[PDB]
Amino acid sequence: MMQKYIVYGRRLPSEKFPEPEVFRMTIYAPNEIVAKSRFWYHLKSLKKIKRTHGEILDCQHIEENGDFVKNFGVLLRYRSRVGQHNMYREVRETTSARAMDKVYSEMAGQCRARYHDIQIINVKEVADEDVRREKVAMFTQKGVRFPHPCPYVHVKRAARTARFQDRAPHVPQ
Amino acid sequence: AERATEKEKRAALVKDHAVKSAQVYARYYIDLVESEKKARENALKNNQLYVPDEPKVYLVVRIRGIVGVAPKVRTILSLLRLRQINNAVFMRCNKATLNALRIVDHYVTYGEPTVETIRNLIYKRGFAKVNGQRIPIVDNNLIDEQLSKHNILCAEDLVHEIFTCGSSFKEANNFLWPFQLNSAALKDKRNNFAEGGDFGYRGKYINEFVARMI
Amino acid sequence: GIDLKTGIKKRKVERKEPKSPNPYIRLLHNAFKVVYENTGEDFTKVLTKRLCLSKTNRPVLSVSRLAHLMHKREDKIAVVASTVTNDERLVTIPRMTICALKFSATARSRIEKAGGRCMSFDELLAEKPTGDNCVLLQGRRSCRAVCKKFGSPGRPNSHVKPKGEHKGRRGARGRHSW
Amino acid sequence: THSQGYRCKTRYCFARKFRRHGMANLTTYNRVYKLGQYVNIKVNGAYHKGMPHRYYNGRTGTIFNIGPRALGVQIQKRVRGRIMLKRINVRLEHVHPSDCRKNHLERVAANDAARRLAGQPVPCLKRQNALPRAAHVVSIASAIDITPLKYDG
Amino acid sequence: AKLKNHTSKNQNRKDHRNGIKKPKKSAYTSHKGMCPKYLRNLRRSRANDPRQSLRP
RNA sequence: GUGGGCCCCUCCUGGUAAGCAGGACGGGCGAGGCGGGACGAUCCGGACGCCGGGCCAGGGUGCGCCGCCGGGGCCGGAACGGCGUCGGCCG
Ligand SMILES: [K+]
Ligand SMILES: [K+]
Ligand SMILES: [K+]
Ligand SMILES: [K+]
Ligand SMILES: [K+]
Ligand SMILES: [K+]
Ligand SMILES: [Mg+2]
Ligand SMILES: [Mg+2]
Ligand SMILES: [Mg+2]
Ligand SMILES: [Mg+2]
Ligand SMILES: [Mg+2]
C-alpha cells in the first residue's frame, strides 16, 4: 500500500534569512497526509523547525516500473520496551514500496513494532554477489527449484464450498 | 396587479443572468487548472518549484456526539454551528478560525473541498434560513430575493462565491442551514487521520468522505 | 440527539391578552388588535399592548397632571388607558380633549364645565384609529405603597423601611448599632 | 489555610525584586493623573500606608476620585456568579499609568491620518487576521538532502 | 458520625448557569466616595450656570 | 425542593496498604431509555413521541448465536534461571 513521495520544505523566511535553505527527503507512506506529517517529524527533530515555523514546498509522488526482481537492503531503527536498536534487513521484491511493505509486516510480526515506532535510515538496491543474508541470497542463484511448500491449501479452499464429497481428495505433489 | 408583471419581468432578467453566469463560470473553472499547470512547467524548466495558494475555505463535519462534552469545546462547536453528529458546514480560513478549530479537532474532520463537492452539497441538500425558518432551495427565485443586495442572484453565483471565498462569503455562508447528511463510515473514531483514525485534518480526502453522505 | 442549550436562553411569557371578565375591554382589545394587524402603526401596537395590563400597571391620571402635561400643546388629543380622577387643589381647569377608559363624575363635570371633551376608546377608534395628533400618556407606575417595601431593610445599602412595628433599637440607630 | 490575616500568603508577591530595594524613584510623584484614566495595581512592599490587599495585585481599573495623597480606583471583581464594582483608595507608590488602550489610540490616529493623506483610493483600514499565504516561486538549485540518523548510545 | 467537610465540585457550573451578571450602568458614576470639596464646587458651578441651572 | 452524596479521568495529602480516610479543574450516576463490555448504577458508543424504509457508531464475524474472506510474519504475577525456537547488534 506504501507509496513513494519526495517532499521539499523550508523555514519561513525572515529579515536575517532572505532565501533560507531547502531540504528534501524521500518518504514511504500510505498517503500524502501521513507523508507530510512524517517529513515535519524529521525536520523538526533534525533541523529544529516545527510545522509552525516553515512551509512544505512540494510533495511529489513517484510511480515505479516492475517486471524484474531486485534485492533491497533497508537500514532502520525501531523502539522496544527496553530501549532503541539498529537493524538491517534484506528482501526480494519488485519495487521499493513493496519491499517496504514486506519490511513493515515482518517487523509487526517478529518484533511487534508498529509504523510510528520505526525510522528508516537507508533503502538501497544490493547486487547479487553483494548480498549478506541467507533467506535472500538463496534465491539469487541460477536454477533454484523446490516442490510446492503448501499444496494442502488448494484442497482445503475447494472443500470450503464442496463441504460434502464421496471420497477424501488427494494432495497432488 | 403590478405584482404579476413585476414578478415575471424580474424572473426573466434573473434567467438571462443565470445563463450568462453559468457559461462564464464554467470558463473560469476550466482555465485555472491550465494556469497552474503552465506555472509548474515554467518552474520545472528552471531549477524552481511552483508553490500554489493555500486553502481559503474548509468543509467541516462533526463526527462525535453530545454526551460528556467540555464547556470550551461545546462553545466552539456552537459558534461553528455544529450541533448534531453528522452535520457539516463551510468555513473561512484565517488564524482566528484555525486556532479555534485545532481545539476541537478530536470532534471534527475537515479539509478543503472541490467545486464538484460544493455543487453536490448545495443542489442535493440545499436549505435556507429565512426569518428563522428552514426553507428548501429548489429554484433561483429564492436566492435573488434574499441575496441580491450582495450581488448573488443564482445557484451558480452562490457556488462561485463559496468556492472563491469572495466579498460576501459571510452572508452567502450564513444563508445556508447546516447540511444534514447521512451517517458516516469510520475506521477509528478516537484516532487522528495521520494515525489511521478518522478525526482531524484529512486534506483532499474530505471529498471521498462526504460523497457517500451527500 | 441535538445540542440546543449553549448560546440559547429560556423563552419568555408576557400578556398576549387581557384576563378581565369585562366585555367592553375584550371588544376594544380585539378591535385595536385588528387595526394593528391591518395598518402597522406602532401607535396602535402600543395601545393594544396597554389594554392588556393588570391594573397595578395602569395607575390613574389626574386632571392637574394632564393640564400640566398638555400645556402649550393644548390642541392635541390626550389618550389614557386608565381612569382619570379629579384634583380639588387646582382651582381652575383648562380646556382639553381627553380620551380615557373611565372618568369620575366630578372629573367629567369639571372637564365639561371648562369646555373640553370626554371621549371613549370606541369614539377614538371611530374618529381616528391610528393616533394622528394623539399623545399616549400614563401615570407613575411606582406610586404604590406596596412597592416602597421591596428589599432588605437591615442591609447597609437599602434605604427601605421595615414592614411591621419595631419598638427596639438594635440595628435601628445606624451603623455601629448592632 | 486555618489562618487568613490581611497579609496571609504574601511571601513572594510582596517581596522586592533583586537589586531593586530602597526608595522609589520620584516619577512616582511627578506623574500627573486625571479623571477617567486607566491604571494597573502593583504593590510596592516598602511603602505600608494605603497598601491594597493582595487580591488587587495585577489588575487594571479606572480612576474615579483624585485626592490630595491617594487616588480612587474602580475594579471589577467576580464574586460567585456576578461582577461587583469595588472602589479602593490607594497611595501613589502602588499605581502606574496603564497602556491598555495605547494600541487603540494609535490606530484611530493612523486611520484619520491616512484618510486625510488620501493614493486617491482609500485603503482598507479594518484589521485583518493573518490570511493563508499566496502562491510564489522558490528556487531549489541548491537542495540539502537529510535522513534519519542511527541510534548512538 | 462523620460527614464531608468541603467541596466546590458543582459550584462553577452553578455560577455559570444564569450567565455572569454585570453591575448596573450607574454604579460606575455614583458620586459616593468622591471628594466632597469637588462635589461642592460642582454644585456651585451648575447652580450659577444660566444654561444649566434649575432654580425657579 | 435541597443543605448524608458517590464514581471516572488527570493532580495531590496521611497510611505497609485498603473496594481506607481527606482535598482540585472537567465529566458522569444520582435523575439517562437503547446496543456492546458473558454477567455489573458509573466502562465503550449513543442520551429517548408513535411507525415504515435506508445508512451505519462502539464491539465483533467456528457451533450455541445475527455476521468473512484474502495476504505477510510468529507460534493474575517478581527477583532470577533456559545449548526451546525465530530474529538482531558488537568484536
Ligand atoms: K420587615
Ligand atoms: K470574595
Ligand atoms: K498504619
Ligand atoms: K437527568
Ligand atoms: K444526568
Ligand atoms: K530467546
Ligand atoms: Mg437534523
Ligand atoms: Mg449567574
Ligand atoms: Mg469508600
Ligand atoms: Mg446484556
Ligand atoms: Mg451463524
Please write down the HEC assignment for all residues of chain D. Answer: CCCCCCCCCCCCCCCCCCCCCCCCCCHHHHCCCCCCCEEEECCCCCCCCCCCCHHHCCCEEEEEEECCCEEEEEEEEEECCEEEEEEEEEEHHHEEECCCCHHHHHHHHHHHHHHHHCCCCCCCCCCCCCCCCCCEEEECCCCEECCCCCCCC
Other residues' Cβ atoms within 10 Å of the Cβ of residue D153 = 7
Distance from CA of B147 to the nearest CA of A (A): 38
For chain A, percent helix, then strand, then coil, each to nearest 5? 30, 30, 40
Mutate to test the interface with D, among B37, B44, B51 (most CBs of D within 10 A): B51
Q: Give yes or no for CB of B48 within 7 Å of strand F.
A: no
* Cα–Cα distance, B195 to B192 (Å, whole number): 5
Element (H or E) spanning A90, and its range?
A: strand A84-93
**D135 CB near a chain B CB, below 8 Å?**
yes
Q: Give yes or no for CB of B186 within 7 Å of strand F.
A: yes
Query: What string of H, E and C letters represents the secondary structure of B5-51?
Result: HHHHHHHHHHHHHHHHHHHHHHHHHHHHHHHHHHHHHHHHHCCEEEE
Other residues' Cβ atoms within 10 Å of the Cβ of residue C107 = 24
Which chains does C contact via 3+ CB–CB distances below 8 A? B
* Cα–Cα distance, A6 to B6 (Å, whole number): 61
The CA–CA distances, whole Å, from C1 to A30, B83, B86, B87 equal 35, 9, 11, 12
**Residue of chain B with shortest Cα separation from C7:** B78
Within 8 A of B203 by CB-CB distance, chain A residues are: 32-33
For residue E7, the CA-to-ligand 3 centroid distance in Å is 27
Helices H, strands E: what count in chain C?
Answer: 5, 5
**CA neighbor of D63 nearest in space, from D41, D45, D36:** D36
Collapsing DSSP to helix, strand or coil, A119 comes out as strand
Q: How far apart are the first and last CA of chain D?
A: 49
Q: A87 near A70, Cβ under 8 Å?
A: no
Give the method used. Answer: cryo-EM
For residue B67, the CA-to-ligand 5 centroid distance in Å is 10
CA C27 to chain centre: 20
Distance from CA of D114 to the nearest CA of E (A): 35
Q: What angle do CA D144, D146, D149 make, to 5 degrees?
A: 155
How many CB pairs below 8 A link D and E? 33
* Cα–Cα distance, D78 to D126 (Å, whole number): 33
**Residue of chain B with shortest Cα separation from D128:** B94
* Cα–Cα distance, C164 to B136 (Å, whole number): 65
Q: What angle do CA C86, C87, C90 make, to 5 degrees?
A: 135
Element (H or E) spanning C118, and its range?
A: strand C117-119
Say if residue B180 carries a ligand binding annotation. Answer: yes
Q: Give yes or no for CB of B188 within 7 Å of strand F.
A: yes
Within 8 A of A47 by CB-CB distance, chain D residues are: 146
DSSP-derived secondary structure letter, B55: P
* Cα–Cα distance, B152 to B171 (Å, whole number): 10
Q: What angle do CA A148, A153, A156 make, to 5 degrees?
A: 145
Q: Do A33 and B202 touch (CB under 8 A)?
A: yes
Please tell me which of the candidates E11, E23, E35 has its beta carbon nearest to residue D65.
E35
Q: Do D134 and B53 touch (CB under 8 A)?
A: yes
The type of residue at D95 is V
Distance from CA of B202 to the nearest CA of A (A): 7
Angstrom distance, A81 CA to F79 C1': 19
Length of chain E: 56
* Cα–Cα distance, A6 to A28 (Å, whole number): 9
CA B97 to chain centre: 15
DSSP-derived secondary structure letter, B181: P
The CA–CA distances, whole Å, from C142 to C102, C157, C171 equal 21, 20, 28
For residue B86, the CA-to-ligand 10 centroid distance in Å is 28
Expressed in Å, this structure's resolution amounts to 2.8
Other residues' Cβ atoms within 10 Å of the Cβ of residue D29 = 9
Angstrom distance, E11 CA to F26 C1': 12
Report phi then psi at B108, rounded to 5: -135, 155
Distance from CA of D52 to the nearest CA of B (A): 34
Collapsing DSSP to helix, strand or coil, A78 comes out as strand
Interface of D with A in 115-144 (CB under 8 A): 133, 138-140, 142-144
Interface of D with E in 49-68 (CB under 8 A): 64-67
